[PDB]
From Swiss-Prot, chains A, B:
SUPFAM superfamilies: Tubulin C-terminal domain-like, Tubulin nucleotide-binding domain-like. The gene is TUB4. GTP binds at A143, G144, G145, T146, G147, S148, G149. This is Tubulin gamma chain. One of its GO terms (molecular function) is microtubule nucleator activity. Pfam families: Tubulin, Tubulin_C. Tubulin is the major constituent of microtubules. The gamma chain is found at microtubule organizing centers (MTOC) such as the spindle poles or the centrosome, suggesting that it is involved in the minus-end nucleation of microtubule assembly. TUB4 is an important spindle pole body component that organizes both cytoplasmic and nuclear microtubule arrays. Present with 7200 molecules/cell in log phase SD medium.
Amino acid sequence: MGGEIITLQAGQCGNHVGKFLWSQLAKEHAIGTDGLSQLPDSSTERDDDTKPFFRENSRNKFTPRAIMMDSEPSVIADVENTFRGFFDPRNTWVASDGASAGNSWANGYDIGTRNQDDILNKIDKEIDSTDNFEGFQLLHSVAGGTGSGLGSNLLEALCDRYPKKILTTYSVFPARSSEVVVQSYNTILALRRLIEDSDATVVFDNASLLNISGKVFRNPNIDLQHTNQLISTIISSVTNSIRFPSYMYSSMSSIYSTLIPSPELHFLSPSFTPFTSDYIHDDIAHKGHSSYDVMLDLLDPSNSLVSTAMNNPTYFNVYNTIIGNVEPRQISRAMTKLQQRIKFPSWSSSAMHVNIGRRSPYLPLQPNENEVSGMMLSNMSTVVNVFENACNTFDKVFAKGAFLNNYNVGDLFQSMQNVQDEFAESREVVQSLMEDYVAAEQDSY
Amino acid sequence: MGGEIITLQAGQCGNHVGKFLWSQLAKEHAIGTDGLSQLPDSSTERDDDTKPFFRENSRNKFTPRAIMMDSEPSVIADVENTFRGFFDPRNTWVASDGASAGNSWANGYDIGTRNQDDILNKIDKEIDSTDNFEGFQLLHSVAGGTGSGLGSNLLEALCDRYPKKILTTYSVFPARSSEVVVQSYNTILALRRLIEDSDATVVFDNASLLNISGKVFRNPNIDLQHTNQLISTIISSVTNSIRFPSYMYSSMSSIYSTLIPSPELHFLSPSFTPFTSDYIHDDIAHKGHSSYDVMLDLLDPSNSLVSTAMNNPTYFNVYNTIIGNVEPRQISRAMTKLQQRIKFPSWSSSAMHVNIGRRSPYLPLQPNENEVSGMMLSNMSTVVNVFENACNTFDKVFAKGAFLNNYNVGDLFQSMQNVQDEFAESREVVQSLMEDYVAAEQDSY
């Protein structure tokens, strides 16, 4: 409905994906770069938005309901841009020492703990402003100092504070062709929080992701902004069915039921086609529905490391396809109906026939070639691989002793490494259970 | 027609003939030299010459589907003249390294490799914008460095990437008394690639082409530019029945299949009279239909060298005559039937009589001074003599150790002297095959 969602932007990564997101929304809902209300333009019949994600000022300036947390560089970059109106200084909460682009989970955890009140004050204002609160979204990286450590501190406080409200995360998991080995410390400490304190993690695995930014966008040199533009296109597309009326995928309850199939398996992998959507650097992106969709099933175009389809599980627990048209609705409609009936995944006792569609209109108000797009959000057994590679990485760094110094400064490691062990035991139980879904032994009655 | 042809121009000569070619087609349909949209028949389609060679970009004016490639001199000349409206800025490419080819195949070849991605981005755009591309036509000379080395390089990629798309070439082969000494080297090294990597090659022997241009169309100071005027008349005419409505059920591929029996017997010979058709030189002629037809079989008039007299022991495999005249259908038809029967082009048992004729009338808005004129395309097994000459001349220059200098800087001729030798052996195999086509022993029973 119009119910509010409060957006939490954490670390370098969150602020960078977030700025692009509001820009992209803005073109779409026909409003200026500072969020000013345009009167003959429509944004309240074409969309619900300009109240779910935005709020109105007394001088009639819409601003996104977002709370920005991180250090100084990123808050300073946005105001220098014209995208300044999407942010406000009161929304900005700024540290000066929880910084690091690289992995330094502890440093971040600890700073959050010092300034618990200053943040909780920000959070309380945003909740007090809500009319009907749906829930929270955290945008971050679990590869930052700032995005990683602090973001996971905040999830534990939000879990405790509210148990029946949705917590969704778009979490960037640290790449495994990286040049740092502290990646393991961040991934393990965060991953505990990400399963329990949050109800959904949409995994973006940077190794695959970075290559998608490299090949398609054709960047001349790679930077944080670049990769983060790729993430803003996928993120905007996932929300399309919410934002448009005449679809019952707008209510809070109905999104949660469809998407989350166990309170323990709720690890999501994205695929999107075409990836460009308002940042086209490519000769063409205009294509029939069939190419896009057939490609959406494929594990080859994916932003997370779900690897290829050979020597890997093919067992999909759920599949959700989110549909965008600006070409005949009937051809696409008929096709979705056929796709569910055909059953691309394998299926056993546990579940069967789990293919769902959400239908949305795509808007050409974005720079496009009059392309049709779609997004896949899927819950797949192949996702266990990612955790596995982390387990292997964690052991090697344990042995070496490399750069424990920052970590001990943090609360978790001065309170022994018993917590980590406890987590390891729980986590393996989660992977074994996900493997079982593959077979016919999960449902046996 | 609705079957598109994409034109490739390589070298000094390829861009020159190309600019002049486009000026000709523009003049013929009563439009501008920048390409303005001002067809008198857009309301019933008696113009279809504004679509197998031109594309619409919605800039209110048609532009030819052409990509121009070389060094700096030719591209500066095209831009300087008002035929610059046929070329978007992306269509003009300047890219030279080691400071032009310098009349060296090995340098020329090497320049294409570095900026390989740049060329492909142009090829991929042009194919994707097209409704349905039949295949490619290359305009270039095998006499330079650039025309040869880059033209060959582009042919090898095209064959490999797309094996199901036809590559027809218009290759200008140099003079056989030689105008530049190093031409013979370029011709061998390019001709090897031309043979394997091309599906069809139309041989234009420059020696012959030049003599005709000086004698028949006068003008003090023949140069490249006069001689290219003759070539632009030829290129226009070979497509004539497809681009005009007279036929439209013919296609590029079926014309190619019938003329070309095997990919090591794909050498076509032209003959032409008056040697313009659609005037853009000077001199008008009128000579009877019987006389006009008789002259076409004859190999003394013709824009390539091959042994004199009709009826050869290295027989005509197949003959295509493209008739252009505004006189009744009945005379042309009665004459193509007669021509096959009389045996002016030799024919054999165990290969059948294969003589086809295509008929066209010339545009009503092309200068009215017309006559019975035609172009001949035949695949005749006497072509071999041009190739042999250039090989004999090549080995003599090489033996002296003169003029080896230019090549040596490029890696390909410095290492791989194998190629020249390869072609000589390759030419003997081809000869053997041409000979079997006469007899029943062209495949074993």
